[PDB]
Amino acid sequence: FNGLTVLPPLLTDEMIAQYTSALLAGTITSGWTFGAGPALQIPFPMQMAYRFNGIGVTQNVLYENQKLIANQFNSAIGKIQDSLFSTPSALGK
Amino acid sequence: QSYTNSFTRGVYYPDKVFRSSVLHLTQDLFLPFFSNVTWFNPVLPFNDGVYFASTEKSNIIRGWIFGTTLDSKTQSLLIVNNATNVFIKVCEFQFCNDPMESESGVYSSANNCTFEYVSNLREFVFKNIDGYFKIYSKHTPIIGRDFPQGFSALEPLVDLPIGINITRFQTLLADYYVGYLQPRTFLLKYNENGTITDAVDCALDPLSETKCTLKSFTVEKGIYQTSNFRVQPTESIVRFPNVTNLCPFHEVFNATRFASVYAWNRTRISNCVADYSVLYNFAPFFAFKCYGVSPTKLNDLCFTNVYADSFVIKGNEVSQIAPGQTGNIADYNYKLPDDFTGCVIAWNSNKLDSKHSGNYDYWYRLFRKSKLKPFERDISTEIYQAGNKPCKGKGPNCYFPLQSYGFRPTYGVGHQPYRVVVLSFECGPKKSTNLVKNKCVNFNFNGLTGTGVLTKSNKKFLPFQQFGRDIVDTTDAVRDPQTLEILDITPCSFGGVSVITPGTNTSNQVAVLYQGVNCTEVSVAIHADQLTPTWRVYSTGSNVFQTRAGCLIGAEYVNNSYECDIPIGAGVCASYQTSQSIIAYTMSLGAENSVAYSNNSIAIPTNFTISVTTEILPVSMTKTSVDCTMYICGDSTECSNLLLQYGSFCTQLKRALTGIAVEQDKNTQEVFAQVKQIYKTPPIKYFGGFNFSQILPDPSKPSKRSPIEDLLFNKVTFNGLTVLPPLLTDEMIAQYTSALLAGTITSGWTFGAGPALQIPFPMQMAYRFNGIGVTQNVLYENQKLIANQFNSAIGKIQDSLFSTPSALGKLQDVVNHNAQALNTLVKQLSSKFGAISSVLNDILSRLDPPEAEVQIDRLITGRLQSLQTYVTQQLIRAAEIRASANLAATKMSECVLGQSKRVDFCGKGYHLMSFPQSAPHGVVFLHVTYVPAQEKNFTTAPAICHDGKAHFPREGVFVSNGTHWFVTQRNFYEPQIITTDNTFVSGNCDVVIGIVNNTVYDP
Amino acid sequence: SNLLLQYGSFCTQLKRALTGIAVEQDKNTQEVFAQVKQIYKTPPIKYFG
Amino acid sequence: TGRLQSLQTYVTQQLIRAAEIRASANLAATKMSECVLGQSKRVDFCGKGY
Amino acid sequence: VLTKSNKKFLPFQQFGRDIVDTTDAVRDPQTLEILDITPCSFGGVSVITP
Ligand SMILES: *[C@@H]1O[C@H](CO)[C@@H](O[C@@H]2O[C@H](CO)[C@@H](O)[C@H](O)[C@H]2NC(C)=O)[C@H](O)[C@H]1NC(C)=O
């Protein structure tokens, strides 16, 4: 330009992706605890049981409908890939 | 005759302004640091001031001789000085003494000696500026003659109003060091008295430029923005179309016969290149009087009207050919206008306008009963009447109104025929040069001027388009006017340079990041003297690194990975390591840690830590009130009247500032005054082992502040601007802090939702464990230890603030930002704003009010823009601090007046409690949190299939130590034997995946 | 440049504001994305229920 | 004067947009510290529904 | 208000300013006495009305 300069961000996109991957891996393996100290491992069907307990739903239902819920999630995430892909105004902000 | 370096010598007092312990950055003709100094009766040229340090005790130096040639034209200055008093004679002589009573004063002459004046390590700054010869003397008689690399200011000794020309200087003899001065920028440090004890250069080193920028002599570790680099232009090229000499020149300029001199030819020079300068060589043009423009070449500008004229005149008559002149030509032939901007070119034409028998052919008008006007043609051929009787023919005083020139070859310059071209306007001089490519160069293509790099273009122009633009509306591509070729205008490389330093105290080596530039490009620019930041960091061949942020020529890249210390950009960061040097590394985003996830693998901690963390929040800002009239106008009635015409700008600014002040008051009111009644701590002071000494008020001192509050307070530190005191005094704020803390430590969180309800502190902490999914039985089971942990943690806090001086960075930043805003506001009072001066009083008693109105208006506009900018900045910062104060109020209403379940809101872990502490313009939250530790790997199963039915823990987790299956709390290892009161049943043993057979014993 | 020199520290104020904005952006992304102590890897190969 | 007023307008607009984006980034940090690093009980904060 | 000053002017400095470039000290050669220039008292007035 004419004196304007766009300074690149300190955190490169690869580093931001690495932070995202680390947060997501800690969320899916160690659950919610990694943000309050050392990451404590726990199987995902147990963390989902805890999260059902956190909304006034006893964990049994989760197990009592484990696989179905997975498919629901497996379906829901799929629609996201389409929802962002089809609508061009999804990333409006 | 050796060459040395001037270490820090050559600092003189620039102005008689006393200053006390300041850092003043001034630009003047200084002696650059570490410059090359000649150590020595040869002739030394006087290049715009010289630093002369004569070091002798034998008094060999007997003064100075100053001048340019000493040829009895210039005032040769003769200066002598024995020890303290200087005898100065500004004489004018051919020679000095050099072409007991060991003195020779013969010189050569004393003619026109207008002025005489009387008054070991003798250093003198000799300058000639503003008609003043300025000699600055430091006569420090050190014992010896060796050149000391030391510091000493130079006081102003003498100023003499000479107003003469000086180019050379020689030393009177009957050693010394000489250095030259250049216009530089220096940061002078005046001490308490007016003693400039230190000076920092600005053109040397990246380190001694951040000092100039920050107005300080000690910089802290970090990266500092500084001046912007640019690759300077290398050459300059001006290009024009194929020079069409085809103007009506040769037929007009080189015709054997013209018409009558009064009847000039319409030599209309339009729509062609008026390159008639070559014809200067065709004929010996003698009377070349170009009054408005004097082209020795003329090929660029296009103009509408030329009104060119052709004349045939004598020699000793051009005196009447001048703008606004009167005489025979002006009053009879053609009047030249007062603003006559054109070329009168008369050339002798004996070889083409003379003949043997007499060239009686060129008539000129001598008599006319009318006066010519500019840009007029006289057609009147009537015989002039000079007698009362009617004029018909010769005889009486009736001359033919045209006299024929008697052109002869024997006549002199004043009578030889001159053929004259008169260019009389109501092109552009420059010869086209060769086109350069791929070089940062100035270009002047067909009048379009700029700077940039011209390369080959693939853009196809339609055969009428000359320029080329973009959405930015900048000239991107130009087609060559001469060779008809297209080429783009890629601009010269530029950007910002930043200086990375580990701090003045740590070291002095630095790094420089030329942002957004190729290392090859910057190295090439360095090689062929192309960079504007004239200082060059010494290239070693390994101290140059390339990254997406730019070229970092200050350090070496290491393949190692460390946490970021000084952010460089694009992940790359720089840090000092000890051998001792600056290194650049890719930022390591912490240690990589893979959690060993499995189908059946859980880890429950068996221990914990009661951690305490500090959370510093700005809550308020300094309340500032500005009197618009007094700030803008120094109690001047005229300025007030002029300001009155600008509407309610002063009223608007006052309203905004008052709103900001009341907003600050409401901010501290909302943050600290959420408690109805001031609560008092009990006198017993025992809280079940918890200490609470550093946070409770300490009565054995004034202000009744806690020791941590005392550390916080001791750790943080004119012209219409007034700092209004806050409504709530710091004692009152401390009283609110004490009341909140006492209600927290006696009634717990109950005092925030109603009347305070007393409760023993261990019981309150037990319920706070209940609030984070840890049964109260833990606390009682580990009371003492936990208390000690808390007692330890808080203790470390007292050291953490004490040891680290950068802990209260945010509040100090707020205070410094307000101080900087006020300092800028008052410093722009000295800004001239394109006016005569920055003081209204001088303008008033220097100019009449009608003229002074313009200058006062300019100053008013500048100061009003300054005030508006300050007010808008304060409004933005007030909104920011309002958001921060709302956050602080939310924390005090949730972290302090209760236990918050929001993660990472009231601390880095499971929140237990929080304690507020007042701080200057802010609050500090001591967040007490539960951080589990001492993990233990375990095997888990979502269910338990005992009586053919699945069993799930009511609130626990099923774990196994290899052999026996227990259920435990999911935040603290407490195994328990599985029973019916401990699990609940749902269905049979088929849907659950990780179900495991076991026994559920009934009690 | 000389004419602009008489307008006081306008350019200095603008540069300080812009640098504050830049470091604010860096701090924004630091606060948003760097709340994790250590980089965690996914298990070598495994599903999650 | 014209160009410096343009610069001041641009800088003020950037400051206001920076305050807006700072509020947005604070909200994003709060979400990642309350919706990602834990389960939030606030209604319609981490999405429409429980 | 012109009061006795303790600022040691070296015998070449006529004026004396501060970091704000406000002349906080002057000395007339006739008196040759260094004196500070602390300004006339001012401020604001505010009306408390019920
Ligand atoms: C809580 O801790 C403080 C600080 O250790 C105790 O106060 C005194 O601390 C100094 C050392 O800084 C000791 O020499 C004193 O003996 C301590 N006590 C007294 C009475 O001055 C404080 O006593 C501790 N709390 C309680 C209730 O004992």
Ligand SMILES: *[C@@H]1O[C@H](CO)[C@@H](O)[C@H](O)[C@H]1NC(C)=O
């Ligand atoms: C200033 O000059 C006085 C003269 O008496 C001296 O006492 C004082 O120490 C000096 N201060 C400094 C810092 O040079």
Ligand SMILES: *[C@@H]1O[C@H](CO)[C@@H](O)[C@H](O)[C@H]1NC(C)=O
């Ligand atoms: C004008 O130029 C023509 C030749 O082009 C010449 O014959 C004529 O006499 C000239 N008249 C004057 C006034 O020069």
Ligand SMILES: *[C@@H]1O[C@H](CO)[C@@H](O)[C@H](O)[C@H]1NC(C)=O
């Ligand atoms: C005309 O051209 C001839 C050569 O052909 C030259 O000698 C003469 O001086 C020129 N006169 C003018 C006025 O150009």
Ligand SMILES: *[C@@H]1O[C@H](CO)[C@@H](O)[C@H](O)[C@H]1NC(C)=O
């Ligand atoms: C710098 O220019 C060279 C030219 O050959 C090129 O190879 C290199 O990639 C460029 N570097 C950058 C940072 O663009």
Ligand SMILES: *[C@@H]1O[C@H](CO)[C@@H](O)[C@H](O)[C@H]1NC(C)=O
């Ligand atoms: C978990 O169980 C599934 C069931 O098919 C199996 O595929 C997977 O390998 C198991 N994971 C282990 C044993 O780590």
Ligand SMILES: *[C@@H]1O[C@H](CO)[C@@H](O)[C@H](O)[C@H]1NC(C)=O
């Ligand atoms: C937990 O750690 C503390 C020291 O921090 C120690 O005193 C205590 O005994 C430990 N508890 C267990 C269960 O190991």
Ligand SMILES: *[C@@H]1O[C@H](CO)[C@@H](O)[C@H](O)[C@H]1NC(C)=O
């Ligand atoms: C996981 O726990 C088992 C025992 O339950 C142990 O043998 C193994 O080493 C642990 N793995 C870890 C701590 O990574």
Ligand SMILES: *[C@@H]1O[C@H](CO)[C@@H](O)[C@H](O)[C@H]1NC(C)=O
């Ligand atoms: C498991 O815990 C039980 C309960 O006391 C103990 O008797 C047994 O030795 C423990 N075994 C292992 C392998 O930890």
Ligand SMILES: *[C@@H]1O[C@H](CO)[C@@H](O)[C@H](O)[C@H]1NC(C)=O
């Ligand atoms: C649990 O025991 C039942 C019989 O009591 C058996 O049918 C079932 O397969 C067992 N489950 C496992 C996982 O061993």
